[PDB]
Amino acid sequence: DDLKLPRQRVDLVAPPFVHVHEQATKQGPKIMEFKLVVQEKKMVIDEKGTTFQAMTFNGSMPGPLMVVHEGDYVEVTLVNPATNTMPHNIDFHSATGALGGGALTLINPGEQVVLRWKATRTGVFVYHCAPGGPMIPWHVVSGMNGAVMVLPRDGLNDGHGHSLRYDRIYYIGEQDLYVPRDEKGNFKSYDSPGEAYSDTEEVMRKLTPTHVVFNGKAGALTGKNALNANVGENVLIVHSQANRDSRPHLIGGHGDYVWETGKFSNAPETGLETWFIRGGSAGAALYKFLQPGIYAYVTHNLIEAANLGATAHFKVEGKWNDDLMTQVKAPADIPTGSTNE
Amino acid sequence: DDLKLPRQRVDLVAPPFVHVHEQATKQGPKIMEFKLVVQEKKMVIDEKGTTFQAMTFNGSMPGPLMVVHEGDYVEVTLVNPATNTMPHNIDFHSATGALGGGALTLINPGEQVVLRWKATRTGVFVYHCAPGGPMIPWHVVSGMNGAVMVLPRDGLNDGHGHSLRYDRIYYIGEQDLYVPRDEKGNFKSYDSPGEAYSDTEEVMRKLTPTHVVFNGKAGALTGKNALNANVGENVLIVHSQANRDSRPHLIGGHGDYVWETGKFSNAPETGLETWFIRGGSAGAALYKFLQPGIYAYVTHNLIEAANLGATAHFKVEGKWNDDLMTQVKAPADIPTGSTNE
Amino acid sequence: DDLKLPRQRVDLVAPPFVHVHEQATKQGPKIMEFKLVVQEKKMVIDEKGTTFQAMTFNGSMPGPLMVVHEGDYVEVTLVNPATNTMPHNIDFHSATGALGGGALTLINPGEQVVLRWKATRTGVFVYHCAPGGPMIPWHVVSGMNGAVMVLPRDGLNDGHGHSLRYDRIYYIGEQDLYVPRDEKGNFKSYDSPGEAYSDTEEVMRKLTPTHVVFNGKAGALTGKNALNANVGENVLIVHSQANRDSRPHLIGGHGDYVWETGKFSNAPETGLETWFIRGGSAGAALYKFLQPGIYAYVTHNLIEAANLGATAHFKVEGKWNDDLMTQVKAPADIPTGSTNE
Ligand SMILES: [Cu+2]
Ligand SMILES: [Cu+2]
Ligand SMILES: [Cu+2]
Ligand SMILES: [Cu+2]
Ligand SMILES: [Cu+2]
Ligand SMILES: [Cu+2]
């Protein structure tokens, strides 16, 4: 029975940015058309230049953020070009049936498939490859995961009948990576994903990542690729982790409104220091910036954040508020008449 | 001062099934009588036939689910037959006092004990053995844990004054196991739990399980022992983990109503993708099936799920709903006029 | 523009105790003055006498609990005596701007600094050292973390317009430690923190602690240093973990009211068995004791609790309530006419 709704093609953009969309809409349901192209390729994952045999949707880790509204249909063309070596598919945690779509989307290199799913559940959700068996974790931890956001048609709210609107949105995809090492402790390089598999599975089995990164590599969102904001902006930070828990924290800020389980039918929590993304989910936090400067956005296992790759920066422009915080006295020598025992 | 209430003897059944019970009841408080028999025995825990020196309540991992109502008294006869080698006891996280009952239930082989506890707290709760000291984790991770559900007398509700009723209930007990390996990496076999202890404690200390299983073994709830349901049924899935965190996910479904901390005085969250069972607790999720077919129920550390044992299946009978999801175009060769870069 | 409020100097006390404070207050905003003195020193961390090159605020692990009210200003003098070897600073997760204060408080040995932050966010919050880069996790897991509580001016409430008042408060700081071992498996000793660093970082990278302790060492809060309470007392248990998740559980009790994300603008959950402290946060639980005796307070990874150090005790005085729990029959030989198969 043909579905007779307007169609809208969406052009995806690379994370941490997000394709243009409306928060609140008075448009009715549409068939929102997306295309995802699998790309297997070697990628650089840390500041020392370590390479890795990655598998991606659309060439990025994470895959791009898709944004639709409650009641939309999402029609995804998944493409597996013949330059790839492996079968792939896609499972939407936002979707109902057929293992999230995985059981309807298995494609060999040289094939494509078209899946439609109704966006009946609001929130942010993981999508990921899941070919079957041990290939499920391996494809996911090789990079084949992203997220989709299903907004209410009226946009976000605080769970107490007040509208919330963001000025800016970023998508932070966190990736646990399992890179083999040689006898001397150095990371091993491989010429294909298949050649990396046996050694990689051994590291995966011990459940300790070698790298934990945002946007696919250590330092991806620091330096010149810091995330911009301004004092007074309400920023939505979507965070996903398809395989492993995370505990996001904005250093020098808070989560004003946080959906840590990521589902907008639930009221957000207020004023959090650190929140929790259960592996296999996306969550989201709003924050209104009150102070200029550098903020570091981390998982608050600080070992993961500083030593395994999992730090991003915000650079925030505006005027410093000395009422909220001030340096009363700059560093100075301890007074000779001081005690301090 | 004798407690003068009606007595009701309950016959426990092996997980993942649950003894017969009422959801809502107009019966008053009763003394609900249960018997648990400790059994130490070698068990098979994975598809390659690895054996393990297990310690169980009632012969199963997990121990059986007990179901009572708020205000009932629970009178448990714990039996430690003389064929066992170790002292045992029981701690109910549902109970108040004496380390959950552990300090009143320590029995040598050849002894039994009778504990009564008042069911003053609603929810699903872990029970486990806890003899003292290092024996506490060892007995628990050897299999000596289960759960108890304390229903409100009016049954479940959504926290907004609406009754929730399940058509079916399953109890998923998740077990982290620590099996020693020899120099060549093969799992070691032992002739008794005591002989396994020193090598097992060394694996336990590194906090990385070798196996993570549902119902006591990899593949326990797949194949012919898949969990049955039908389209339209509201299914309650109780999940426990006595020692280690888990992140349950129903692949192709959702948690319609989830008590991830497991306590029915709290409103459930709605529409979750993945939830979180903190080690040392039970949680519960309701889901109304909307689509037929195979569903995989996992912890969403997919390495744990696919490679360490932690996958169950549901087989759901009914009619496919092409409005919720459809394969618009089956796999086909990528059109020659396609781009895709 | 000078801040013209009354000043109040607070004398900090060593955990698990808490400096004197008011729950509800009709005092207006004050400038609450605290001093923290960094101390680098070797400390004993387990029952076998293992030593560790620790770095502390005020000589303790955790650092002391600070208590203020919403709207207060907190003026902290941080002192780094010249006997220390390292630069240090402080990041308050309660504060807004400048990386929580870290970017305004970096002091060399021989220096002090004065930071003021406005207590605009209610809850319990972590504070920790964070000098930069890999020094951030290393200073934190070396012991440089504590917590601050920002009470509402009206004190705590249940989120449903009812006042909650504690009779007693304890602060449980949980510390993950990473102690190197030699070839034979024995813990290594070092003459300075700098000398320990390279070997310690290698252990940190594998993300598995060697020790998980409350109040700085295994057994700190057992034996003669058990935590006292009485039947009928409402006890607030503040729990922090600056780097790694925890799952607190009071064995033989419950969490009557739990703020597991730790922020008093959110209603607490009721009747929990086990709660979850996300690494990089503090949470809090109220419990009214109903039974006398020993209670064990653990993280409910029981391996961590029994074998890595993470057990505390409460010793509770009062009268046993046989309605809540009773030993119906003491241990006895299994009756000869029993079955039990
Ligand atoms: Cu794939
Ligand atoms: Cu999934
Ligand atoms: Cu036992
Ligand atoms: Cu327990
Ligand atoms: Cu420091
Ligand atoms: Cu921090």
Author numbering:
A (entry chain A), B (entry chain A), C (entry chain A): 2 to 342
The study reports:
The two redox Cu centers are coupled via the neighboring Cys-His residues that form a conserved hard-wired 12.6-Å ET bridge.
Online optical single crystal spectroscopy has been combined with the MSOX X-ray crystallography approach using a single blue Br2DNiR crystal maintained at 100 K in the as-isolated state (i.e., in absence of nitrite). Optical spectroscopy prior to X-ray irradiation confirmed that the T1Cu site was in its oxidized [CuII] state, as expected from studies with other blue CuNiRs (e.g., AxNiR). Data collection and refinement statistics are provided for dataset 1 (DS1), DS5, and DS20 in Table 1 as representatives of the data quality and refinement for the individual structures. Two conformations of the catalytic Asp residue (Asp92CAT) in its proximal and distorted position are also seen with two conformations of channel water (W4).
